[PDB]
Amino acid sequence: EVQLQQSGPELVKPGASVKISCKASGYSFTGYTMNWVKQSHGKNLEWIGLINPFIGGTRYNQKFKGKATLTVDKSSRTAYMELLSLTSEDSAVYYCAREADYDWYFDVWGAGTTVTVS
Amino acid sequence: EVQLQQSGPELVKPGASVKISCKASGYSFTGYTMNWVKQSHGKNLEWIGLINPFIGGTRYNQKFKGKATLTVDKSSRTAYMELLSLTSEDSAVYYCAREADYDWYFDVWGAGTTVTVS
Amino acid sequence: EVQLQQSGPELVKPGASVKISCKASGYSFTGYTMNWVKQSHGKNLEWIGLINPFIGGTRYNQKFKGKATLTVDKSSRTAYMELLSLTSEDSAVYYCAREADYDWYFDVWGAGTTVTVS
Amino acid sequence: DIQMTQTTSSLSASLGDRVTISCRASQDISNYLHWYQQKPDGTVNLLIFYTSRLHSGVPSRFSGSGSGTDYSLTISNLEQEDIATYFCQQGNTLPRTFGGGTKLEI
Amino acid sequence: DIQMTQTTSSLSASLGDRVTISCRASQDISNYLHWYQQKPDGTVNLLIFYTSRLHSGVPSRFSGSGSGTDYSLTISNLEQEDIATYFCQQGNTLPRTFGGGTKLEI
Amino acid sequence: DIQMTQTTSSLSASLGDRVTISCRASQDISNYLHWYQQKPDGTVNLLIFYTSRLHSGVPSRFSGSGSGTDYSLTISNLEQEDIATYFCQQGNTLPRTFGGGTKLEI
Amino acid sequence: ILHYEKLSKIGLVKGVTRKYKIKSNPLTKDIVIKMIPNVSNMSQCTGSVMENYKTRLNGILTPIKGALEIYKNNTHDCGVCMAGVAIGIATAAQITAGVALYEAMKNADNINKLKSSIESTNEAVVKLQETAEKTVYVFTALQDYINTNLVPTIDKIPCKQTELSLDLALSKYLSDLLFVFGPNLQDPVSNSMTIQAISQAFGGNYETLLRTLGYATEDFDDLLESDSITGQIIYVDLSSYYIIVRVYFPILTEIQQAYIQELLPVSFNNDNSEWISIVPNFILVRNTLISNIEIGFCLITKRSVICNQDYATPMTNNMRECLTGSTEKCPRELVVSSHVPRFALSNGVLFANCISVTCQCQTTGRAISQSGEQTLLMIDNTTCPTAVLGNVIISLGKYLGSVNYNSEGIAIGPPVFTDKVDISSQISSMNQSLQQSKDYIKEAQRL
Amino acid sequence: ILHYEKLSKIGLVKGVTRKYKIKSNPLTKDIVIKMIPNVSNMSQCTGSVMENYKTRLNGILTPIKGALEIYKNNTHDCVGAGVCMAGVAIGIATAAQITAGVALYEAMKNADNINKLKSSIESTNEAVVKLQETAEKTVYVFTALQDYINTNLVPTIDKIPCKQTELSLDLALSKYLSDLLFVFGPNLQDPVSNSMTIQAISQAFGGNYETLLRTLGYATEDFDDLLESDSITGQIIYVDLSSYYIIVRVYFPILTEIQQAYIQELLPVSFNNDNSEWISIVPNFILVRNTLISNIEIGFCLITKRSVICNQDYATPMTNNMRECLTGSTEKCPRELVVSSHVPRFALSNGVLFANCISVTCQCQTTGRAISQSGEQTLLMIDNTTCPTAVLGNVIISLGKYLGSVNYNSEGIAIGPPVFTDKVDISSQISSMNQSLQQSKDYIKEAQRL
Amino acid sequence: ILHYEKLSKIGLVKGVTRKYKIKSNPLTKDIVIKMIPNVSNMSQCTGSVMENYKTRLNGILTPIKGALEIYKNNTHDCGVCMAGVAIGIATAAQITAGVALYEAMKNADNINKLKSSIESTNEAVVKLQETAEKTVYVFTALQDYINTNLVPTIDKIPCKQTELSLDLALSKYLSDLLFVFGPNLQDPVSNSMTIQAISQAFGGNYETLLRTLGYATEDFDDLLESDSITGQIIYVDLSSYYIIVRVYFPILTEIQQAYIQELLPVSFNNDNSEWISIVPNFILVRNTLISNIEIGFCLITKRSVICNQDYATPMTNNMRECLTGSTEKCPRELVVSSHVPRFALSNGVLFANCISVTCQCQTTGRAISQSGEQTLLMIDNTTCPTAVLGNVIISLGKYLGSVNYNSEGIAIGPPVFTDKVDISSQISSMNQSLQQSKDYIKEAQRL
Ligand SMILES: *[C@@H]1O[C@H](CO)[C@@H](O)[C@H](O)[C@H]1NC(C)=O
Ligand SMILES: *[C@@H]1O[C@H](CO)[C@@H](O)[C@H](O)[C@H]1NC(C)=O
């Protein structure tokens, strides 16, 4: 069974930074591309960006170009997202998802991580 | 004058094998292609195969593919044909001939060698 | 200012050989092509030939092909023309000229050198 | 760039009924539409991809149709576990965009 | 693959007469026909190649013609040394095939 | 190969008058004509190149025109230092050739 | 950590810095290509050219189907399972392509239901519609020429000429096809064939194929010219003469912590002659590693290098030491030709070999001189702003670096030769010298 | 006598075995090609474009005839029989040119019969025509631009002002002339040869060689193999400057197989030594002939699934150390480091897979357990003795049985020295080796003095 | 000062001597090329294909104008002056091309005054005449096809077919354009682009352009085939979709005291095998200097070699020693193939390897024998007036040289290998031997 495990809830003081991790098991880590998704209190979903661990390439949304940094670690099969200069509107839920092979849809999702700023 | 000399007649017991030689004189041996022809009782003619000694290539008729083996010896300017697993219907007359340069006709023929099986 | 300086007048016995020199100043010597022109009595002008000193190439008029030899010297920025086997009709005025980059016209001319054969 | 609009946000239905949910696009997307379901506990699952294809393990109760700029998802004889939120997503041009979402209730 | 048929096996002629031999084919061979002569002692000689060309040293008594799938060889005012066997061979497609043969007699 | 002919060799003019000099060719030269001036002391200067373009430093008193095989040079209100010899040269094909020359006088 | 100041004295001047991009994550579509036109409206005197054309085309089309059937037989469901014994010999790319073919075979079953409608088309580009959720596009090879030229003139000329024209057109089409779809195609299973080569079955008009499918992006030309749009053959019909093709359309991603540096070579003066340095012109720096790159397989633009595959190459230790500052390890070559670059401009600063070219300052009207112990000259506006090197006048900026650039020397490396025969000659000479040394040292071994 | 077991541990896996065959013994035909169309039926307002076209074509056609006349002049028969040549009047030549001159002299015998139909050649007004003098001799005439004139220009001669038709005809002629200069221009330095292919010759007909070959009546099973290996050639034997046509002879050979010879290919797979990936640098194609091992430049040949077809023998010598490496001495085989992320990592041969499972995911389907490689192994061999089914990423594979040593995974080998194959690195390495040699000799001088 | 007698024994027979010539001094012309046709004659059914075509063309044409605008903005009269700081990075060729562009920009102002007349043309080739002094030529890309095919057939077929035909023709034209005018064109400023590449904007018909421009010379084909006729883009119009091009036409000049010598290789017998000699086939002698030349970039004729640039290359000292008579320094390679030249003819004298070929004299009917201590045989008419080889009979002249040619020996060089993998193996083996020798040297140093 393929599954994704995320870290716990986070509380951040304003103006600081935080890193969120996502771990994968049950398949070959380097054969698939990872995506990050943000859900706010208005229940609308936003796409942040994608990372390809086989070649080491990244693609970003222009809205989050300077806010998020995406990295991978192939030894422990873990993906990291770092968020910078958080304000009060950055409190939300974050998902790590796995992409399909030939069309742009996601088939495996994580549980979600909640981040609050105060 | 260009001429071809063949070996003498042979009497073979059934199930045995023989080798027939053809010697060439009066021209350059490696500049031409050699052919072998069989004539049986009833005076029908059958083409066996050809050998090119400059590059060392052979071409066979599908009827005689497993029966005959063609070789050359460039030092003494000789051509050899070997027959395998003879029966009573292999008693015939055999000719070595020299091919033309640009069209598929023979201009020089040998005297002929008669092979009998009993 | 760009200018061309030629040598003085000279008297030649019939059957001898002559050299005429041309010096340039005020510009880059190897960046332009040099031409020689002849004017005889009756004020007719004739084109002799051209030399390119950057690659060391020459081009001649077929009428003067065996009469003149063109040479360049890049150390002192000098051009030489040598005339061979003079007769009485070679008494004339000789002009040293520079050529424009694109179209075949001359923009700077020398003073001229008179040659008399007697 | 491309905007997804779901007009209906809340829908009322009874057990064993037929429900249809519509999704609309501002441009032609060439049948590159996918549907997702979000449970009250917060888990997300894929239902339909490429406008007509069922994901592995999904019951045959769901169906999808549509073309051009109008698409629809149909659920038949709905059970108790079909109370969730439904999203439509386009996959034709970067960046990827999602829809508003529609909530079902008894 | 390609079959050569000579419909006449034996032919009678007198001194000084004209004789014609024929050769048929089951396919179009595009003028690639050759003629050979076999003496009673067993020697073989080439007479005509490419349907109209005389080999070196051959007397001008022989001639050849034909096209398509029908070809013929003609000998005029035959002498005593023209009593032999005659074969036609095609050279258009592998494997090479020979004709049946036609015998002349006085 | 290409011959250039100036019909008039000597011309008479007064101060402040308009003068025109013509130059002909035996072939089409495609506007590759240049004009030169020779002073009595023996210096040569360029005036017009490519049939209409003024060389740097030349007064606007001179002008040139023409096409095909006929070309002309025009000088207006000529003054004292305009008494010289004028030559037309073609630059379309090797070898380069010059014209006969035309002399002005008061 | 390239040492630019020491490299500039050797003759290497730094240029433009670019990024590195590689493709990934494609989108898929599928199309039908027909290889025989419809001649129903000119059928009165078509002659017998169509039967010969069909006979010729069948022999070309048969081996491709024969090659596909090998993977068709031995693949089934279990994910996807393959019988390795029945295949025997294969590479990894072939196995991946076979898996992709098995995945793509699902939609061909739905497509093949419209064979009767495919046979009846008589236009160049047709859209066939079964249900609103599935449509297919049909392209016909030679229909436009027949519809525009031959049919309207069928009554003005004797139609033997029309027969000859049709035969000539078919022969020309076959001659064009044979370069791509002949026996050169040995492995049709792979998915590395470009769309430009595939479009030869439609006469080379890939623009129509790409624009009709609805693809549109800002990197269209960049993806097209870097050979990143590929296709694969999945089904061949021998009784109807058409093929089914799947087309992939990827996106570009940027490699992180990586860039490519370019260098400009300028000849320099040593002893009494000219020399030029032999160093790679493009250098890849990834994280903290320096390496080579075969840039002949990649597209170069003004701010990025686009490739379909990683092309990193190892580099020797001596070259790395040369690039990090040791100028005594860098080889050089003599100049014999009269055409060679002799100056360059970098950030408003001029680097010139003023011994071979003529150097003057316009502000003071005085020539600039280079001594016999200097390799190059650096010119900026702290000495004089305006400079002339010929028919060009240039104004200069200020140099950032050491103020004693023109008063410091370096060490030079050993000469080399780069011609093909010279390599063999040098190897022979070195081997002979080594053998002679060993033969002598045998005597010292004896002693 | 290749040692496949030791080679597989280095990363070279055996593949397909093929045959070797070369062409010989052609048969010949000849054809007439015209380079100017017939414009009679549109002759009312052709303008003056035909004269300019003829003047342009004459200056292209003249040098070819000038080059042919040199051999035409100095060839005859000396009775004293073969062909007689005067070597003093020729001066400088090679063997191929002499053979081509002999062939030209042979073809000039049949050119004379064709040159008798000059009046009928000029009167043709079709694209492809067959001319019959007698039933014995036929000839085929192809015209360069007749179809376009007959189909397009003539039917529209009255619907538009013909000043536009003049421009259309001139544009068509110029477009036709643009393509010729790539083949028949000054690049054709030596017209006396028989190495020009039929594809290049077909440029005078617009690139349509299929029409020529199918009209001439050629038909065989290996037509495409002969066509794609550049084995069908042609030779120019006659040029007419007054009527603007050429006579070409076409040769058609057959393929013969070389006896006691075969070609073996290998597949490379990366392997692990201490902490890095390596690839071996060995030729990928080996020719074995009469128990002799050699190289072959396969870039000039055609590769099929059963045989390799060439028009010429392409054998190359091989060094002694490479032969020692191929016979089983793995200590003399070079290797190169891997820096890129794209490289093959496993291969399949006879139902047995060889994989570098350190750098790739490696597990068994039957038991669910991963397959591990230690630091002292270069590769892993997997067959059904360990477990039948294997998973390699997204593919499940069923395996056969290995024929060989049962202790394959428990035995080691010796490795060769590392190398670099870039162009600048060769010069750098040569310089470094020369420096070391010079210092060694400088010390050995002082050693000599003592 | 090549020693031909000693070289002929190695197997290098002298051939033809040629001249060396390079181009210079070009003439200039200016032309206008339109990239959009006129469809006013068939406006009944055009659809919306023209808007899509214009949108596609604008995106292609924009970057070229963007690249030109950099140099357009930083050049002004003052010779001409350039702002070095505003440009930043450049090479000498780009600066020269920018100067040429500024000089050429003068006539474009006069040409641009006829925009209305340019946009109103409806013929393939038009001559526009404002005054008798200045005239311009306009070439339209696709006007002939529309004028000849589509317009006369506008009433016999449905207009949808006409729209499809027009769209297909435009797409094919764009597909042809993209190979040359796409993102491959990174540096449009330079003036090294040939006329053949530029002609793609007119459909590849450069003959029409060159003929209409009025150029005529004896060496037209020689200049055309050596890539010496070039062009440069100077102005792009984004509103009317046309470009202005300048064309250069040079002349050829001969280099003084320079010639090129060719050698013919013939195999020879040493012990029991055939060998060939690895020596450059073309040698350049200039004044008194011997050097190499990369002849793959030049055109070879029967009496001269024509190039657009000097291509001299340095040569090693050992090769120069080998070419002057020291045959102990010339390497050789073994022959394994069955196809190799075995004889040659020079000045009526035959050089043959009679071990591997059959040699006999026609007059005496006796074979000619070569011993095991000879490499080649020289044959002239003093011993055999008429020779026969294979199927050719040849009559011979007289040799001008030593009369004891066949009784003198030579020394031979060392064997080599010329394969890349073999080169790597040889380098590795030599390095290992050198390291072992240095280790033993260290051991002897310890003792
Ligand atoms: C392993 O594969 C071979 C195929 O060559 C087969 O003969 C054998 O029975 C297989 N062994 C097992 C245990 O399946
Ligand atoms: C040998 O050739 C030379 C060179 O042409 C000639 O002068 C001489 O007469 C010839 N001698 C004989 C005997 O043919």
Numbering used by the authors:
A (entry chain C), B (entry chain H), C (entry chain B): 1 to 52, 52A, 53 to 82, 82A, 82B, 82C, 83 to 100, 100A, ...
D (entry chain F), E (entry chain L), F (entry chain E): 1 to 106
G (entry chain D), I (entry chain G): 27 to 104, 112 to 480
H (entry chain A): 27 to 106, 111 to 480
What sentences appear in the manuscript?
Antibody 1H8 binds to a quaternary epitope spanning domains 1 and 3 on two adjacent protomers. The interface between NiV F and Fab 1H8 buries 1132 Å2 of surface area (984 Å2 on one protomer, 148 Å2 on the other), featuring six hydrogen bonds and two π − π stacking interactions: one between the heavy chain and protomer 1, the other between the light chain and protomer 2. The stoichiometry of the NiV F complex with Fab 2D3 was 1:1 (Fab:NiV F trimer), while the other complexes were all 3:1 (Fab:NiV F trimer). Antibody 1H8 exhibited potent binding affinity with a slow dissociation rate near the detection limit of the instrument, requiring us to estimate an upper bound for the KD at around 20 pM. Five antibodies (4H3, 2D3, 1H8, 4B8, and 1F2) competed with 5B3, which binds between the lateral and apical surfaces of NiV F38. Antibodies 1F2 and 4B8 bind to the same epitope as antibody 1H8, spanning domains 1 and 3. The CDR sequences of 1H8, 4B8, and 1F2 exhibited high sequence similarity, consistent with their shared binding epitope. Six of these ten antibodies (4H3, 2D3, 1H8, 1F2, 1F3, 4B8) bind to the NiV apex in domain 3, consistent with previous reports.
